[PDB]
Design an enzyme around this catalytic site. Structure first.
Site, PDB file in Angstrom:
ATOM      1  N   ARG A  58       0.780  -1.268   0.000  1.00 28.96           N
ATOM      2  CA  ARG A  58       0.000   0.000   0.000  1.00 28.96           C
ATOM      3  C   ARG A  58       0.801   1.302   0.000  1.00 28.96           C
ATOM      4  O   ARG A  58       0.211   2.362  -0.104  1.00 28.96           O
ATOM      5  CB  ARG A  58      -1.007   0.058   1.170  1.00 28.96           C
ATOM      6  CG  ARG A  58      -2.243  -0.807   0.997  1.00 28.96           C
ATOM      7  CD  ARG A  58      -3.281  -0.570   2.087  1.00 28.96           C
ATOM      8  NE  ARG A  58      -4.061  -1.795   2.284  1.00 28.96           N
ATOM      9  CZ  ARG A  58      -5.360  -1.944   2.026  1.00 28.96           C
ATOM     10  NH1 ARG A  58      -6.096  -0.934   1.557  1.00 28.96           N
ATOM     11  NH2 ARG A  58      -5.936  -3.125   2.249  1.00 28.96           N
ATOM     12  N   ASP A  59       2.116   1.223   0.130  1.00 31.00           N
ATOM     13  CA  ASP A  59       2.992   2.399   0.229  1.00 31.00           C
ATOM     14  C   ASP A  59       4.427   2.087  -0.167  1.00 31.00           C
ATOM     15  O   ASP A  59       5.373   2.646   0.380  1.00 31.00           O
ATOM     16  CB  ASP A  59       2.962   3.067   1.629  1.00 31.00           C
ATOM     17  CG  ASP A  59       3.578   4.467   1.623  1.00 31.00           C
ATOM     18  OD1 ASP A  59       3.729   5.088   0.539  1.00 31.00           O
ATOM     19  OD2 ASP A  59       3.971   4.948   2.705  1.00 31.00           O
ATOM     20  N   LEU A  60       4.573   1.238  -1.171  1.00 31.07           N
ATOM     21  CA  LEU A  60       5.855   0.976  -1.786  1.00 31.07           C
ATOM     22  C   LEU A  60       6.411   2.224  -2.494  1.00 31.07           C
ATOM     23  O   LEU A  60       5.796   2.803  -3.380  1.00 31.07           O
ATOM     24  CB  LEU A  60       5.733  -0.195  -2.776  1.00 31.07           C
ATOM     25  CG  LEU A  60       7.080  -0.516  -3.445  1.00 31.07           C
ATOM     26  CD1 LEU A  60       8.115  -0.902  -2.396  1.00 31.07           C
ATOM     27  CD2 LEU A  60       6.866  -1.616  -4.475  1.00 31.07           C
ATOM     28  N   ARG A  63      11.663   5.795  -0.672  1.00 31.92           N
ATOM     29  CA  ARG A  63      11.790   6.216   0.720  1.00 31.92           C
ATOM     30  C   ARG A  63      11.626   5.029   1.665  1.00 31.92           C
ATOM     31  O   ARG A  63      12.310   4.946   2.691  1.00 31.92           O
ATOM     32  CB  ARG A  63      10.816   7.355   1.068  1.00 31.92           C
ATOM     33  CG  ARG A  63       9.327   7.021   0.961  1.00 31.92           C
ATOM     34  CD  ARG A  63       8.374   8.152   1.456  1.00 31.92           C
ATOM     35  NE  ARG A  63       6.964   7.848   1.155  1.00 31.92           N
ATOM     36  CZ  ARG A  63       6.441   7.871  -0.082  1.00 31.92           C
ATOM     37  NH1 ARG A  63       7.192   8.207  -1.139  1.00 31.92           N
ATOM     38  NH2 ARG A  63       5.163   7.528  -0.299  1.00 31.92           N
TER      39      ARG A  63
END
Ligand SMILES: COc1ccccc1CNc1ncc(C(=O)NCCCN2CCCC2=O)c(NC2CCCC2)n1
Length: 169
Positions: A58-60, A63
């Site tokens: 969900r947030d690859l 960073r």
């Protein structure tokens, strides 16, 4: 989250990573095509393991990938698939989208995707058939481009991505 793969960050409470996140790193170096592709294989092995366990990330993004001292990378709106923005739908296929954009960050050494575009016009901009541009001197652009097909069933699985990337040697 008792996962155990060498391209997935361990849970210890996290390990200390001498060389930082991959974004800040790639950014230190701007301010060879061969080391960048290894970065990509790593994240792809990491992501293959997670999705096999049906973990949807969900947030690859760069960073959120980490470089260890051995310099392997492990996995820990501008990255979001068409269907995640429109329908709040998150799957392996939108994770594959995000990887596509991470593949681009790498090749631009940490440029903000869609740099001169506001969060609010990315959708409009994406339904136009427009994608992130082939960065100045980049071979690879084709794989990341598949990752952003409008139909999420045309995006290549993490197993295919890793192989196309491993192969490219
Ligand atoms: C984000 O949290 C983690 C996830 C997965 C594994 C480990 C961690 C936390 N461990 C960890 N260890 C060392 C660091 C760390 O800062 N190491 C020094 C890196 C300094 N740099 C930056 C550019 C080149 C360099 O050496 C760290 N930093 C967090 C991550 C992103 C920004 C701040 N984080």
């Amino acid at each position: 989250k008792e996962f155990d793969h060498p391209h997935v960050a361990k849970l210890v409470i996290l390990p200390f990573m001498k060389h930082g996140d991959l974004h800040a790193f790639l950014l230190a170096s701007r301010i060879p095509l061969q080391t960048l592709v290894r970065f990509m294989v790593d994240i792809a092995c990491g992501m293959e393991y997670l999705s096999s366990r049906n973990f949807i990330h969900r947030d690859l993004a760069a960073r959120n990938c980490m470089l260890a001292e051995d310099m392997t990378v492990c996995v820990a709106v501008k990255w979001l698939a068409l269907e995640s923005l429109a329908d709040n739908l998150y799957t392996v296929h939108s994770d594959v989208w995000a990887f596509g954009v991470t593949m681009w960050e790498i090749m631009t050494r940490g440029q903000t995707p869609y740099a001169g575009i506001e969060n609010a016009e990315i959708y409009n901009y994406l339904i136009g058939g427009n994608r992130l541009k082939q960065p100045p001197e980049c071979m690879v652009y084709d794989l990341m481009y598949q990752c952003w097909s409008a139909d999420p069933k045309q995006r290549p699985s993490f197993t295919c991505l890793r192989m196309e990337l491993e192969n490219i040697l």
